């Protein structure tokens, strides 16, 4: 709908199939499956970037740095 | 529900000469109820996703794979498949618990599975698989908590020994997610 | 505050030099940039504005090399035995760094092109990074040759690094052969491992995702050093590294008034070791309260049996 | 600026005050096996009602 | 009022790693706790209502906490 | 124990009952229920304080402010 | 196979632009890539687990949506 697909579909689909190879299990992916993955990944990244920008503001900095990403993920409870 | 006597049996099997305190026993019981609720909840959602009306050993196995981390998942799946095949190969044992070669009560597990209204019907192999998974996790925790008690030169497992066993194991800490206890 | 021997500059061919270096700390409120030259007994830093700062080989307590891998700059750091003054006030740490590049790319209509040429520019950045690391490595080898093993550079072990907040900023601290170091952020953190009496870990308990690390020096007038808010996942690795440098460590749930503890020790150093020395950091009611499990309320019958069968 | 937490007098907060260190029994009530364990169906219905309550607010 | 003592607030922040406290924190902390405790009680009393009990048990508290964070007691 | 006593038990239970007067007019609490409540409140506040000190460190301030508390809660997903 | 390098720097730049970021440090790209590879891995690990529960070799869209509910 309103969401625009920023990430190019082909390289993302390459990445999804690489992740299948690392797991060492051979399965096929529907096109609808790959697009739902792409929408979720982009949304998660945007949401993480929002929290990251919040951290950068708190530091009185206009530029975001890996410090900001790590702090936001740490509070979120990720690994 | 109370699983304490079965945890005591498991404790005597991995560490024959190690006891446990009342607070530490209550911790083990709450862990078993917590994971039972999580695995049972995951098996019911899988049963409604595939439009089945019955939970079998397959639904319990996929639930355990989803909730436990890698090695714990591999070890729990192995124990579950072994208990099902023992129960599926031989009819000779008088009790359903000894039929699968388990200390945990398969009958109590099957009764609680049906009580929770997780599905229309509960298969025969699901409670055996769930009991085996619960037994292995209790064994791994009690083995590590017993190892901590031996290193402290304590003859019984107290709460802090349980905490050390959990958070020092990556997968055990991830599985409990640092649940709070005091 | 401490007199320094005059720099021995010889005019000859042997003059290892390195360009494009920013000095920390600066001399004015503006970032002074210049060049570093390796002479007979020390270093001479020549600024564009003519400013010259000298550092003797014998005055260097820790020469440190931070490669540009994983960072935005590449740094040569020097922690000195005695403080020196080149600007107002005295500075105990002097470093020289070169930026990798792309420090702050900003978003907007200027980067709206989003061309695919960034792959080639990435190679140009990779060549620049390999150029910067190779030039720093060659300059270090020339200088280590000149001193005749008087001074050895140390490279941090990023495998042993951890995140902590000594200076109210969560940075990365990396052990070296001789010290625990973080030289990517000014002010720098340098603690000599030899000068550490012991380590005490505070706020270590279940359900906590962070802890404080306390560094106590063999010199008891020196205030302890705090490293706050380290992830609990880094505790066991740090402990092991301490065991490799023979540094004793203890644990504690409660944070301790170290300024008071040091004062009590220094005002009566004798009575402190008569109670046992540092025996208070390591343990040796709760046993009496707790009750060991016994069979109670009999047990479930477990004899219900029955099965679906066919 | 602020207020230090690690200094002399830190111990003053950690005094055992017995009149406040224990729960009082004014509203506290003890069943002696009078209360009952919560039943599974009631728990399911309670979770459904709480979900409905959450939906109408946010 | 809330009566959650300022020394109790200090002890909590001390265990969390806080080194220095702004004076505004005490009332801010009280307000934050007032939210958190209210939400748990709202869930717990609902579990209590569905059972024919006028007394909230520990199991009701644990059931509410499962919605946010699990506790291994009772 | 002196270290383990983070929140005084009595003022906490008065606050629990004051909240209890807003959902069911006549209520009674079990001793184990309140003790679990105090344990949970202490752990949640400590977890929030840790995140807060992480936020204060990010701001180059030794002292924590309501700025830090609000940011940690916002990222945790508590209050928008 | 390095396809986590295949998520372009412009694509990371666009995602931050939609996220409200005005200015970005150079080290962000690699951190973003590693975070993404972690997140995609968790979902795919979960998603394939659903597919073989239904005894299928083809991951459907419904497998992806149920895995996202876990995270």
Swiss-Prot record, chain A:
Spell out the post-translational modification annotation for this entry.
Answer: Acetylation is generally linked to gene activation. Acetylation at Lys-67 (H3K122ac) by EP300/p300 plays a central role in chromatin structure: localizes at the surface of the histone octamer and stimulates transcription, possibly by promoting nucleosome instability.
An MF annotation (GO) of this entry: cadherin binding
State the UniProt keywords alphabetically: Acetylation, ADP-ribosylation, Chromosome, Citrullination, Disease variant, DNA-binding, Hydroxylation, Lipoprotein, Methylation, Nucleosome core, Nucleus, Phosphoprotein, Ubl conjugation
Mark the residues carrying the PTM N6-glutaryllysine.
Answer: 1, 24, 60, 67
Spell out which residues are annotated as carrying Phosphoserine.
2, 31
Q: Which residues carry this modification: N6-succinyllysine?
A: 1, 24, 67
Q: Which residues carry this modification: N6-lactoyllysine?
A: 1, 24
Q: Which residues carry this modification: N6-(beta-hydroxybutyryl)lysine?
A: 1, 24, 67
Q: Name one GO cellular component term.
A: nucleoplasm
Q: Which residues carry this modification: N6-(2-hydroxyisobutyryl)lysine?
A: 1, 9, 24, 67
Q: Which residues carry this modification: N6-acetyllysine?
A: 1, 24, 60, 67
Q: Which residues carry this modification: Phosphothreonine?
A: 25, 52
List residues, modification N6,N6,N6-trimethyllysine: 1, 24
Subcellular localization, as worded in the UniProt entry: Nucleus; Chromosome
Residues bearing the modification N6-crotonyllysine: 1
Which biological process annotations from GO are given for this protein? chromatin organization; epigenetic regulation of gene expression; gene expression; nucleosome assembly; telomere organization
Residues found modified as N6-methyllysine: 1, 9, 24, 67
Q: Which residues carry this modification: N6,N6-dimethyllysine?
A: 24
Give the UniProt family note.
Belongs to the histone H3 family.
Question: What task does this protein carry out?
Answer: Core component of nucleosome. Nucleosomes wrap and compact DNA into chromatin, limiting DNA accessibility to the cellular machineries which require DNA as a template. Histones thereby play a central role in transcription regulation, DNA repair, DNA replication and chromosomal stability. DNA accessibility is regulated via a complex set of post-translational modifications of histones, also called histone code, and nucleosome remodeling.
Record protein name field: Histone H3.1
Q: Which organism is it from?
A: Homo sapiens (Human)
Swiss-Prot record, chain B:
The alphabetized UniProt keywords are: Acetylation, Antibiotic, Antimicrobial, Chromosome, DNA-binding, Isopeptide bond, Nucleosome core, Nucleus, Phosphoprotein, Ubl conjugation
Share the record's PTM remark: Monoubiquitination of Lys-86 by the BRE1 gives a specific tag for epigenetic transcriptional activation and is also prerequisite for histone H3 'Lys-4' and 'Lys-79' methylation.
Subcellular location(s): the record lists: Nucleus; Chromosome
Q: Name one GO cellular component term.
A: nucleosome
Gene Ontology molecular function, alphabetical: DNA binding; protein heterodimerization activity; structural constituent of chromatin
What main location does UniProt list? nucleus
Cross-link Glycyl lysine isopeptide (Lys-Gly) (interchain with G-Cter in ubiquitin) maps to 86
Biological process GO annotation list? defense response to bacterium
Tell whether Zinc-finger is among the UniProt keywords. no
Q: Does the entry feature the keyword Phosphoprotein, yes or no? A: yes
The job of this chain, per UniProt, is described as: Core component of nucleosome. Nucleosomes wrap and compact DNA into chromatin, limiting DNA accessibility to the cellular machineries which require DNA as a template. Histones thereby play a central role in transcription regulation, DNA repair, DNA replication and chromosomal stability. DNA accessibility is regulated via a complex set of post-translational modifications of histones, also called histone code, and nucleosome remodeling.
Please give the subunit comment from the record: The nucleosome is a histone octamer containing two molecules each of H2A, H2B, H3 and H4 assembled in one H3-H4 heterotetramer and two H2A-H2B heterodimers. The octamer wraps approximately 147 bp of DNA.
Which family, according to UniProt? Belongs to the histone H2B family.
The name this protein carries in UniProt is: Histone H2B 1/2/3/4/6
The beginning of the lineage is: Eukaryota, Metazoa, Chordata, Craniata, Vertebrata
What is the primary gene name for this protein?
H2B-I
Span of the entire protein shown here: 36 to 126 of 126
From Swiss-Prot, chain D:
Record field: compositional bias (Basic and acidic residues):
44-58
Localization annotation: Nucleus; Chromosome
Residues covered by region (Interaction with DNJC9): 1-58
Post-translational modification, as annotated: Phosphorylated on Ser-41 by ATR in proliferating cells. Ser-41 proliferation is increased by genotoxic agents. Phosphorylation by the CDC7-DBF4 complex during G1/S phase is required for the initiation of DNA replication.
Which residue positions does Phosphoserine occur at?
A: 41
Q: Mutating residue 41 to A: effect?
A: Reduces phosphorylation by ATR
- Coiled-coil blocks: none
Cite any additional comment in the entry.
Early fractionation of eukaryotic MCM proteins yielded a variety of dimeric, trimeric and tetrameric complexes with unclear biological significance. Specifically a MCM467 subcomplex is shown to have in vitro helicase activity which is inhibited by the MCM2 subunit. The MCM2-7 hexamer is the proposed physiological active complex.
Q: What does this protein do?
A: Acts as a component of the MCM2-7 complex (MCM complex) which is the replicative helicase essential for 'once per cell cycle' DNA replication initiation and elongation in eukaryotic cells. Core component of CDC45-MCM-GINS (CMG) helicase, the molecular machine that unwinds template DNA during replication, and around which the replisome is built.
Family per record: Belongs to the MCM family.
Name of the protein described by the UniProt record: DNA replication licensing factor MCM2
Species the sequence originates in: Homo sapiens
Query: Which gene carries the instructions for this protein?
Result: MCM2
Covered residues, full protein: 68 to 125 of 904
Curated annotation (Swiss-Prot), chain E:
Q: Give residues where N6-(beta-hydroxybutyryl)lysine occurs.
A: 6, 52, 66
Q: Which residues carry this modification: N6-succinyllysine?
A: 6, 52, 54, 66
PTM sites of type N6-lactoyllysine:
6, 52, 66
An example Gene Ontology CC term for this record: nucleosome
Question: What GO MF annotations does this protein's record show?
Answer: DNA binding; protein heterodimerization activity; RNA binding; structural constituent of chromatin
Phosphothreonine carried by residues = 55
Q: Which organism is it from?
A: Homo sapiens
Q: Which lineage? A: Eukaryota, Metazoa, Chordata, Craniata, Vertebrata
Quote the protein name from its UniProt record. Answer: Histone H4
